[PDB]
RNA sequence: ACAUUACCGAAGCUUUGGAUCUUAACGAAAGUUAAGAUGGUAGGGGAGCGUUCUGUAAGCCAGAGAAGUUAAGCUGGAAAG
RNA sequence: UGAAAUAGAACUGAAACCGUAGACUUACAAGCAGUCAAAGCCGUAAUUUAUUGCGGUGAUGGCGUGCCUUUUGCAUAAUGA
C-alpha cells in the first residue's frame, strides 16, 4: 500500500455513449434523429449541399 | 412508552348501531325529499362520517304516493327504459308510472342521487319506501322526522 | 351536431360563465390601483398577483423590469414617471399598497 | 385532561405522560422545552378556548430522541421520451415526552 | 479482457421482484411485466403522496359540516366566525374533536355564533 | 381464428380443471368375495354375479 | 413432512400429467380399499399407473410396519409432477414440419394409518 | 339580471423541516449565515455506482465453510451497498 | 459403500413453466389490475391484557388511457415483443 495518488484532471474518463437514458447519451447517442448524419456519414468534400 | 396519535380518527363499524328514521313525503317536493333521504342514508349527519364504509342510518319513507311536483311535470316528465333488444325503447310518463307503481318515482330519484358502486347499491338496500301512511317495521321503533 | 358550431358554442359558454362577484372584486382592485397611481412621489409596495405564464411578451418584460418574477413578489418602489408608466402598463396584474 | 397546543405552527393534542412526534428540533433545544401557545384546555369536564391562546397556560416537555421515518421514493418518467428521475427521502422526527400541562 | 460476469441482471431483477410481491397474475414473477407495473406504481405513489393532503382535508371539512348539521350554523359561517373571533384551531383538530369530545366542539360553536 | 392475446393463467386453469374431470364409477360389494365391484357389472375378481358364475378368471 | 419410510415414487411414467391429475384427485384422501377399487375399475392409463404406485407404497408401509393391514391404510397425499419430454417430427403439407412433444410424469404417493 | 357578506378549490403562495448549486458577507481556512434557483425532449457541461482483468498482492479473508443462488432485516439523495 | 445416495449416470440447479399443503379472500359483480385511505380475520412483539406496532390477506372509497419506436399530435383500431 502506497497509493500512487494521481494528479487531478490527469485523465478524462471517456464519452461512453449509447449506454442508458440516465447518462444523457442514450439511445440516439448524440447523433440526433434521422437523416444522413444519423448513419455514420457526412459528404466530406467541403460540401455545401 | 405510548404515542398520542394526532391522526384522523376512524370508528370501527362494529361499534356503530344503526337506527331507523321515518320520513313523511306528503305535500313535499320530490327532489327535496330525495335529497333529505340521501343525506340521512349516506351518514352525512354524523361527526364520524366516512365515505369508505357504511355508517349512516336507515330510512323509511311513508306516503310516497303524495309527493307534489311543480310545473307541467305531471304531464311531461318521462321515465325511459331499454330492453336491450333493438328498437326496444319504452317511455313512461309520470302519471302512468305512478299509477302502475306508486313507489317508483321516489325510488328512482333516490337511486339517481345516491353514489354509484357497491356501497351505493348497499345504501339503496338500506331504504324502504311505502305508498300508504303505514309501514311494517313497527318492531324497530323508528324515530320520526 | 356540426363541429364548427359545437366548438363555437363550447367556447362561448365558457366565456360567458364568469361570476359577477369575481368581476366586482376585480373592479374594486382596479379602482384602488388607479387611485394609488394617481398620486406622486410616494413609496409604494407592489405585490405580484397574476402569473407571468401566457401573458404578452412586452408585459413580461415590464414585470421583470419592475423586479417581480413570481406571484407573491414584494417590491418597494419610489413613484416617479418611469415607475408610474410601468405600473400603468401592468396595472391588471399587481396590487399596490402604500408605505407610510 | 388534554391540551390543544401549537408548536412551530402545527397543532397537536398533548396529554400528560405521553409522547409527541413533531418536526425535528434543533440540537440547541435538546434539553427542556416550554411551549406557551396553548389553543385549548379541557380539564376534567370544563374547557377553555384561547383567542388565540389561553393565557397563563404552559406545556413543559423533555426532549427524548430523534428518529427517522420509513423511506419514500419520488419517481417520475416521461412516456416514450426515455427520461426519468428517482430520489430517495427519509424525514426526521423528534419525540418529546409531555410532563405537565399548566392549566 | 472479456468482462462477462453476469451477476448484474439477476440482481436488478431480484430487487424488482422483491418490491413487486403481491401483484396479480404474471405481474409478480415475469421481469418485463413486473418492471412495467412497478414503474407506473412508483409514479402513482408520488402523485398520491401529494394527493393525500387534499383527500384528508376534504374529509375533515365534510366531518365538520356533518357535526354542525344539528345547529343552525352553516359551516361557511362557522369558519367565518372562527376567524373573526380569532380562534386559530385547525381543520384536523376540529374534526377529531367533534368525535372524541362532542361537547367541547359544541361549546366552540356556541362561542362562534357571537 | 387465432388467439388474440394469451389468456390468463386463471382462465386456463379454470377451463382445464372443469374439463379434465373424470367421475367415479359407482360401487357395490360382491355378494360372494366381498370385493368392491362396479355396480351392475360382473365381479372381475371372482367371476360371480348375483350368485351366478359367468367368467373363468385366470392369471 | 414426508415419512419417507411409507412412500412410493414412480419417475418418468408414460403419460401426461394433465391426464393423470384428475384420477389422482378422485382418490386423494380415500381409504386404500376404495382407492384400489377405483383404480382397478376406471379404464385410464393414468389409473393403471397410479394403481402400481399406490400398491407399491402400501407394500412398503406394510413391510416396514408389520402390524398394519390393508384396511387401516388411507392414501394421505398424492402428487403428480411432470417429467422428461421427447420431441419427434410430424411432417405436413408443403414441406412444413411440426415438432410433436411426448410428455412423461412423476408420481408420488404416501399412505398413512387411518384416523 | 343587479347588490351585501362568505366559503370551497392546484404540485400557485404562506408555514414546518431536509438536499444541492450560485452570489454576497462573516471566518485563518474549513465551514457558518443573508439572498434566489433548482419541469424538461434534441443537445452541451460536471460528478458517481457497478462489472471484468493487471500491479499494489509470496498481502488479507476461506474447509471452523470461498464464489454462486435463496430467505429475512437494515442503510444511502440514485445507480446500489 | 461413501464426508455427502434430494453425489445412483451425475457438481453448484436460478428464472420461465408445472404442482401439493396451510392462512385469508372470492358466486349483485364493470379492476392497464396499481397507488392513496381503510374495517374484519390470521401470525408475531410489546404495554399485564385488549389496545398499539411490525407482517400477510384483504370487504369498501378516491384517483388512474401498459411499455417502446416514430410523430404537429398515439390508450390509440400506427410500429415492435
Ligand atoms: Zn366377486
The DSSP code sequence of A11-31 is S------SS-STTS--TTTTS
Distance of CA C10 to the CA centre of its chain: 27
CB contact under 8 A, B49 and E56: no
Q: What b/e string do you get for G24-61 counting C-beta neighbours within 10 Å, with b at 16 or more?
A: bebbeebbbebbbbbbbbbebebbebbbebbbebbebb
Identify the CA nearest to B39 among candidates B111, B107, B114. Answer: B114
List the nucleotides on chain H closer than 7 A to a protein CB: 1-18, 36-37, 39-48, 50-53, 55-57, 68-72, 75-81
Q: Is the CB of F14 under 7 A from strand I?
A: no
Spell out the residues 6+ positions from residue D2 whose beta carbon is closer than 8 angstroms to its own: D13, D14, D15, D41, D42, D101
| Contact call for residues B31 and B23 (beta carbons, < 8 A) | no
Q: How far is CA E4 from CA A17, E1, E7, E13, in A?
A: 19, 9, 9, 18
CA distance D28 to D46: 37
Q: How open is the CA angle E47-D6-D4, to the nearest 5 degrees?
A: 105
| Contact call for residues B57 and B40 (beta carbons, < 8 A) | yes
Structural Rg of chain B based on CA atoms: 19
Spell out the residues 6+ positions from residue E87 whose beta carbon is closer than 8 angstroms to its own: D39, D49, D50, D51, D52, E108, E111, E112
Instruction: Name the residue among D12, D15, D19 with its Cβ closest to that of B1.
Output: D19
Nucleotide nearest to E84 (CA to C1'): H6
CA distance E5 to C50: 59
Name the phi and psi angles at A6, rounded to 5. Answer: -65, 145
Identify the CA nearest to B123 among candidates B31, B49, B69, B68. Answer: B49
Q: How open is the CA angle G80-G81-G84, to the nearest 5 degrees?
A: 135
| Contact call for residues C66 and C95 (beta carbons, < 8 A) | no
- Residues of E within 8 A of B56 (CB-CB) are none
CB contact under 8 A, A22 and D82: no
Show the DSSP H helices in chain G as ranges: 17-27, 32-41, 45-64
CA distance C5 to C12: 10
Interface membership of D74 toward E (CB under 8 Å): yes
Identify the CA nearest to D60 among candidates D28, D99, D97, D17. Answer: D99
CA distance C43 to C79: 6
Q: How far is CA D80 from CA C8, D6, D56, E42, in A?
A: 34, 47, 62, 17
What are the beta bridge partners of residue G99? G89
Identify the CA nearest to G34 among candidates F26, A49, E23. Answer: F26
Interface membership of D77 toward E (CB under 8 Å): yes
Q: D90: which 3 cell numbers?
A: 427519509
| Contact call for residues B50 and B119 (beta carbons, < 8 A) | no
Helix axes G45-64, G32-41, angle to 10 degrees: 150
- Residues of A within 8 A of D78 (CB-CB) are none
| Contact call for residues B55 and B16 (beta carbons, < 8 A) | yes
Burial tier of B8 (Cβ tally within 10 Å: 0-12, 13-18, 19+): middle
CA distance G109 to C58: 87
- Please give the distance, rounded to the nearest whole angstrom, from the Cα atom of residue F30 to the centre of ligand 1: 5
CA of G103 to C1' of I9 (A): 22
| Contact call for residues C77 and C44 (beta carbons, < 8 A) | yes
Q: D28: which 3 cell numbers?
A: 440547541
Q: How open is the CA angle D35-D37-D41, to the nearest 5 degrees?
A: 100
Distance of CA B65 to the CA centre of its chain: 15
| Residues belonging to chain B with any Cβ–Cβ distance to chain D shorter than 8 Å | 1-4, 6
Element (H, E) at E35: helix E31-67
Q: What b/e string do you get for C8-47 counting C-beta neighbours within 10 Å, with b at 16 or more?
A: eeeeeeeeeeeeeeeeeeeeebeeebeebbeeeeeebebe
Q: Strands, DSSP E only, in B9-55?
A: 20-24
Cβ pairs B/E, distance under 8 A = 34
Q: How open is the CA angle B64-B67-B71, to the nearest 5 degrees?
A: 155
Minimal C-alpha gap between D77 and chain B (Å): 31
- Please give the distance, rounded to the nearest whole angstrom, from the Cα atom of residue G8 to the centre of ligand 1: 29
Q: Tell me whether the omega of the peptide bond preceding residue D52 falls within 30 degrees of 0, making it cis.
A: yes
3-state secondary structure of C95: strand
Interface membership of F10 toward E (CB under 8 Å): yes
CA distance B145 to B133: 14
- Residues of G within 8 A of F38 (CB-CB) are 41
CA distance E78 to E112: 7
Cell 396590487 appears where? C95
CA distance A7 to A28: 34
CA of G11 to C1' of I8 (A): 14
Q: C74-78 and C43-48: which strand pairing?
A: antiparallel
- Residues of D within 8 A of A21 (CB-CB) are 82-84
Q: For chain A, list the contacting chains (3+ Cβ pairs, <8 Å).
A: D
Distance of CA B142 to the CA centre of its chain: 16
Distance of CA F1 to the CA centre of its chain: 36
Show the DSSP H helices in B3-141 as ranges: 30-42, 73-76, 94-100, 104-113, 118-125
- Please give the distance, rounded to the nearest whole angstrom, from the Cα atom of residue C82 to the centre of ligand 1: 120
CA distance A1 to E72: 84
Q: What b/e string do you get for B66-104 counting C-beta neighbours within 10 Å, with b at 16 or more?
A: ebeeeeeeeeebeeeeeeeeeeeeeebebeebbeeebeb
* Method of elucidation: cryo-EM
Spell out the residues 6+ positions from residue B90 whose beta carbon is closer than 8 angstroms to its own: B80, B81, B82, B83
CA distance B26 to B145: 12
Nucleotide nearest to E30 (CA to C1'): I16
List the nucleotides on chain I closer than 7 A to a protein CB: 14-21, 28-30, 32-40, 47, 52-53, 56-63, 66-71, 74-75
Amino acid at each position: 500500500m502506497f497509493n500512487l495518488l494521481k494528479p487531478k484532471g490527469a485523465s478524462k474518463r471517456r464519452k461512453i455513449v449509447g449506454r442508458g437514458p440516465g447518462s444523457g447519451l442514450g439511445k440516439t447517442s448524440g447523433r440526433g434523429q434521422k437523416g444522413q448524419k444519423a448513419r455514420n456519414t457526412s459528404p466530406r468534400l467541403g460540401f455545401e449541399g | 412508552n405510548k404515542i398520542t396519535n394526532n391522526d384522523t380518527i376512524w370508528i370501527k363499524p362494529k361499534t356503530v348501531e344503526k337506527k331507523w328514521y321515518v320520513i313523511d313525503a306528503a305535500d313535499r317536493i320530490l327532489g327535496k325529499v330525495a335529497v333529505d333521504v340521501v343525506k340521512i342514508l349516506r351518514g352525512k349527519h354524523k361527526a364520524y362520517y366516512t365515505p369508505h364504509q357504511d355508517l349512516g342510518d336507515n330510512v323509511i319513507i311513508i306516503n310516497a304516493s303524495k309527493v307534489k311536483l311543480t310545473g307541467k311535470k305531471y304531464q311531461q316528465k318521462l321515465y325511459y327504459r331499454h330492453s336491450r333488444y333493438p328498437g326496444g325503447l319504452y317511455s313512461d310518463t309520470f302519471r302512468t308510472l305512478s299509477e302502475r307503481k306508486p313507489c317508483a318515482p321516489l325510488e328512482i330519484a333516490i337511486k339517481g342521487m345516491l353514489p354509484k358502486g357497491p356501497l351505493g347499491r348497499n345504501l339503496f338496500r338500506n331504504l324502504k319506501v311505502f305508498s300508504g301512511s303505514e309501514h311494517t317495521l313497527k318492531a324497530q321503533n323508528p324515530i320520526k322526522l | 351536431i356540426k363541429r364548427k358550431l359545437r366548438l363555437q358554442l363550447k367556447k362561448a359558454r365558457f366565456n360567458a360563465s364568469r361570476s359577477r362577484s369575481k368581476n366586482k372584486c376585480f373592479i374594486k382592485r382596479m379602482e384602488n390601483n388607479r387611485k394609488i397611481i394617481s398620486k406622486n412621489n410616494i413609496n409604494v409596495q407592489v405585490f405580484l398577483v397574476r402569473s407571468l405564464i401566457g401573458k404578452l411578451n412586452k408585459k413580461v418584460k415590464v414585470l421583470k423590469a419592475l423586479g417581480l418574477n413570481k406571484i407573491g413578489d414584494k417590491k418597494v418602489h419610489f413613484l416617479n414617471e418611469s415607475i408610474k408608466g410601468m405600473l400603468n402598463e401592468t396595472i391588471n396584474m399587481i396590487l399596490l399598497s402604500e408605505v407610510m | 385532561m388534554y391540551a390543544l397546543v401549537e408548536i412551530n405552527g402545527k397543532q397537536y393534542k398533548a396529554i400528560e405522560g405521553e409522547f409527541l412526534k413533531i418536526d425535528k428540533i434543533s440540537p440547541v433545544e435538546k434539553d427542556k422545552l416550554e411551549f406557551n401557545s396553548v389553543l385549548l384546555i379541557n380539564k376534567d369536564g370544563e374547557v377553555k378556548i384561547g383567542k388565540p391562546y389561553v393565557v397563563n397556560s404552559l406545556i413543559r416537555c423533555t426532549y427524548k430522541e430523534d428518529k427517522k421515518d420509513k423511506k419514500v421514493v419520488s419517481y417520475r418518467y416521461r412516456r416514450r421520451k426515455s427520461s426519468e428521475r428517482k430520489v430517495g427521502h427519509r424525514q426526521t422526527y423528534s419525540y418529546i415526552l409531555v410532563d405537565e400541562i399548566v392549566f | 479482457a472479456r468482462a462477462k460476469n453476469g451477476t448484474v441482471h439477476v440482481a436488478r431483477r431480484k430487487r424488482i421482484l422483491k418490491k413487486t410481491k403481491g401483484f396479480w397474475g404474471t405481474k409478480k414473477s415475469n421481469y418485463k411485466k413486473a418492471k412495467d407495473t412497478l414503474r407506473k406504481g412508483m409514479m402513482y405513489a408520488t402523485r398520491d403522496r401529494k394527493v393525500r393532503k387534499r383527500d384528508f382535508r376534504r374529509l375533515w371539512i365534510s366531518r365538520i359540516s356533518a357535526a354542525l348539521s344539528d345547529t343552525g350554523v352553516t359551516y361557511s359561517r362557522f369558519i367565518e366566525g372562527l376567524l373573526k373571533s380569532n380562534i386559530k384551531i385547525n381543520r384536523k383538530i376540529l374534526s377529531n374533536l367533534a368525535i372524541e369530545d362532542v361537547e367541547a366542539f359544541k361549546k366552540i360553536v356556541l362561542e362562534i355564533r357571537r | 381464428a387465432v388467439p388474440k392475446f394469451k389468456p390468463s393463467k386463471s382462465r386456463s386453469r379454470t377451463r382445464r380443471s372443469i374439463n379434465m374431470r373424470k367421475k367415479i364409477p359407482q360401487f357395490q360389494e360382491c355378494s360372494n368375495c366381498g370385493n368392491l365391484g362396479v355396480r351392475h357389472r360382473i365381479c372381475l375378481k371372482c367371476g360371480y354375479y348375483r350368485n351366478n358364475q359367468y367368467l373363468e378368471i385366470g392369471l | 413432512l414426508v415419512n419417507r419410510r411409507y412412500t412410493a415414487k414412480g419417475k418418468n411414467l408414460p403419460s401426461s400429467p394433465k391426464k393423470v391429475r384428475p384420477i389422482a384427485d378422485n382418490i386423494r384422501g380415500e381409504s386404500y380399499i376404495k382407492a384400489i377399487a377405483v383404480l382397478c375399475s376406471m379404464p385410464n392409463k393414468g389409473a393403471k399407473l397410479l394403481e402400481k404406485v399406490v400398491k407399491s407404497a402400501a407394500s412398503n408401509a406394510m413391510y416396514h410396519n408389520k402390524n398394519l393391514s390393508e384396511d387401516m391404510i388411507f392414501v394421505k397425499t398424492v402428487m403428480v409432477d411432470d417429467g422428461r419430454r421427447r420431441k419427434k417430427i410430424w411432417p405436413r403439407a408443403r414441406g412444413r414440419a411440426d415438432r410433436l412433444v411426448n410428455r412423461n410424469c412423476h408420481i408420488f404417493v404416501e399412505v398413512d394409518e387411518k384416523k
